[PDB]
């Protein structure tokens, strides 16, 4: 791989420079190189991996949605035939998006999850596994779709089980996992009641634990609690 | 339009 | 080239889809493919070429500025030695930016400028030649720098001579050329007085011609006149 | 910070 000759610390340093420059494709390539050195990632390094790939796949998902909507307007009654180009270009962006998700999933499987023993690393990686299967599910239409949805659900569920045994209800990883699994239920699994129940229980259990926190921890937890309440406001 | 976790 | 098998009209159609999806690298690759079909570009197709490459090089220029500023903070008295990584990464983004500029310049030279006989096409391409030599000048530091600056100046000057013979003073191409050549004088050529004189004469000659325009032409011209006045406000 | 032509 093209980063094989670069020191691990230099890859981390350049990932941070790439973030500052809003060069997220470079950031992701640097962090892939760092993971492929074979050492476990620190907390900060796990968050650089997540920021890089979330920005890359976020642009692809936004593009895919725009193209899918145009392809939808084209298959309506009265719409002029314009040829294969919209489908072809949606397919090109879809394939690229699937490739990024497969790359992240492959890093998690080789070998980040198997080496992750502490709750804060293992939950973080299992959440990421759920997230990138969720992004695959957003574009899935084939014989595959049920198994991709179940892979997302399974990863999220294992992360949830660990988080509820090992982390306080205010832990930001635990909160963001619950937030994302609730969105999985709403947007992917056709389970809006499950989505709403999880968001409300998560919010209420975090509320009750805020008294234990420092000012800085309180700010970290309440930021994600607000996202839970924003979804509940949208959904109810 | 669902809010997911911020990176 | 990878677009050689795609119809010209399909490349144009996909460039527009890529714009809507904010996929500017794809947009630029589609428009490069369209130019390489060898036919002249329409007005709309020239503006798709310009939008695509301006967005690609704009992201690279923004990243280069962030990295150059960090590399500047590193060469100050008291700054800790952090190794070659900032310079290496600035160099990587610089090389990529130079590659995009060389690609645009190569399309203009093979063969868009030589085939462009109407004032509206020839001025547009010569302006673009000045612009991408200007972006090369922004990062030039070598034995090359004077010749790159002179190449920008020469292209802009030929565009200016044609525009003042062949176009009204309100023509948006003529206005945007003058705007950009004024920025060349201010930012590249160390000629702020020339920059200010050109911006003010351009603005005043356009003001005097607005009475001839339709409401829609008036809106197009006044939008670029406001950019001239915004620069004059910054510079005086 | 100079304004150049909008694409
Ligand atoms: Cl395509
Ligand atoms: Cl580099
Ligand atoms: Na090493
Ligand atoms: Na078509
Ligand atoms: Na371990
Ligand atoms: Na614990
Ligand atoms: Na053809
Ligand atoms: Na270093
Ligand atoms: Na011609
Ligand atoms: Na004319």
Numbering used by the authors:
A (entry chain AAA), C (entry chain AAA): -4 to 231
B (entry chain CCC), D (entry chain CCC): 40 to 46
The authors write:
Aminopeptidase N (APN, CD13) is a transmembrane ectopeptidase involved in many crucial cellular functions. However, the exact mechanism that leads to APN-driven MMP activation is unclear. It was previously shown that extracellular 14-3-3 adapter proteins bind to APN and thereby induce the transcription of MMPs. The family of 14-3-3 proteins are highly conserved eukaryotic adapter proteins, which are involved in several hundred protein-protein interactions and therefore a plethora of cellular functions.
In addition to the high-affinity site 1, we could identify pThr63 as a second, noncanonical binding site (site 2). When pThr63 was combined with site 1, a remarkable increase was observed in the overall affinity (∼500-fold increase of 7 versus 11). Most importantly, peptide 11 showed a lower stoichiometry value (n = 0.58 ± 0.01), indicating a bivalent binding mode in which one peptide binds to two protomers (or one 14-3-3 dimer). The collected data set was used up to a resolution of 1.20 Å. As the biological dimer is assembled up by one of the 2-fold crystallographic symmetries, the electron density of both peptide epitopes (site 1 and site 2) is averaged within the binding pocket. This indicates that the binding grooves of the 14-3-3 dimer harbor both APN site 1 and site 2 simultaneously, with an overall occupancy of 50% each. The bis-phosphorylated peptide 11 binds with no preferred orientation to the 14-3-3 dimer, and solving the structure in P1 does not lead to a better structural model. Within this model, we see that both sites bind in the commonly observed N-to-C orientation within the 14-3-3–binding pocket (orange and green lines). Overall, this leads to two possible orientations of the bis-phosphorylated peptide bound to the 14-3-3 dimer.
